[PDB]
Symmetry: D3
Subunit: 64 residues, 6 copies
């Protein structure tokens, strides 16, 4: 089982390692697949490239 993860830019390397570790464990427990077979990779998206209801994460970050 494979997981393709999409996150915004700006997260710590510790958080990205945890994404790999916890998502891999999550797939192992949910499907009982051998960890050897599990692959997880992470796309880091610029805030200008991430739209929520038609507004970019960048424009939202300017607000409270």
């Amino acid at each position: 089982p494979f997981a393709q993860i999409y996150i915004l830019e700006g997260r710590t390397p510790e958080q990205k390692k945890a994404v790999i570790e916890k998502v891999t464990q999550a797939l192992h427990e949910a499907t009982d697949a051998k960890k050897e077979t599990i692959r997880v990779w992470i796309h880091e998206m610029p805030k200008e490239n991430w739209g929520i209801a038609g507004v970019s994460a960048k424009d939202l970050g300017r607000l409270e």
Copy 2:
């Protein structure tokens, strides 16, 4: 944060619900993102459509 999951066909609905639940929890804990923002969806791939080292999961399933 979003997770696009690829699994082979043939898993129970309980396993697929667990994929959604555990991967969502994994992303929440790894990034501290609000669960409201997290999305996880699952592509179920036919065994004929899944290649490992040039051999399909289907041809492998014939073997021990």
Copy 3:
């Protein structure tokens, strides 16, 4: 420019044709790319395979 669209199962064929038409027009107008170059394809996801905040679209559809 290419668009990979993810929607839930259960939409009319007219809505899917409109997705192809309107997304193609949207990319043409936003980037001025020739329509000849634009490609849009649609993955229809089972409601059991679509997680929102850890809950599947299927379990949500049972509710009001």
Copy 4:
């Protein structure tokens, strides 16, 4: 409904904001989904990483 957009590097930020805005509107009109649910994100591909009929956008950009 979600849209994963693939464009070549080198487009203005105004064009990328327009991609987010117009694709979101396109999905809203085609499916009648609430804008709150719609997500659009953009991968910007290096010209060396984009093949058309076996030739990269980079090699093509050298030509007329």
Copy 5:
């Protein structure tokens, strides 16, 4: 190295096995990656779900 392949519905199983075999060999030769590490999977898209310049493969299939 991983390859995610998108083809229209309607191809023979022999063609899909060849996709897995030849794409795997192509990645092995281009990158010198061990075949053990290479993964290739195939999404088969309904013709109604595949847009070329704003027109679906289905509407095109009606024409000559």
Copy 6:
């Protein structure tokens, strides 16, 4: 037919051109699709962003 390729960062430009060329040829031969229709694009993943059995390519690169 389209191929979305995922490789680790750090490969030569010659290898990436070969990916585009050989994968395009592989799809042409496997499906008999006209080369004009074939598209191949390449995501280069940071080693920190690529998990194998729960361990990142980066941590593995430290080892023998």
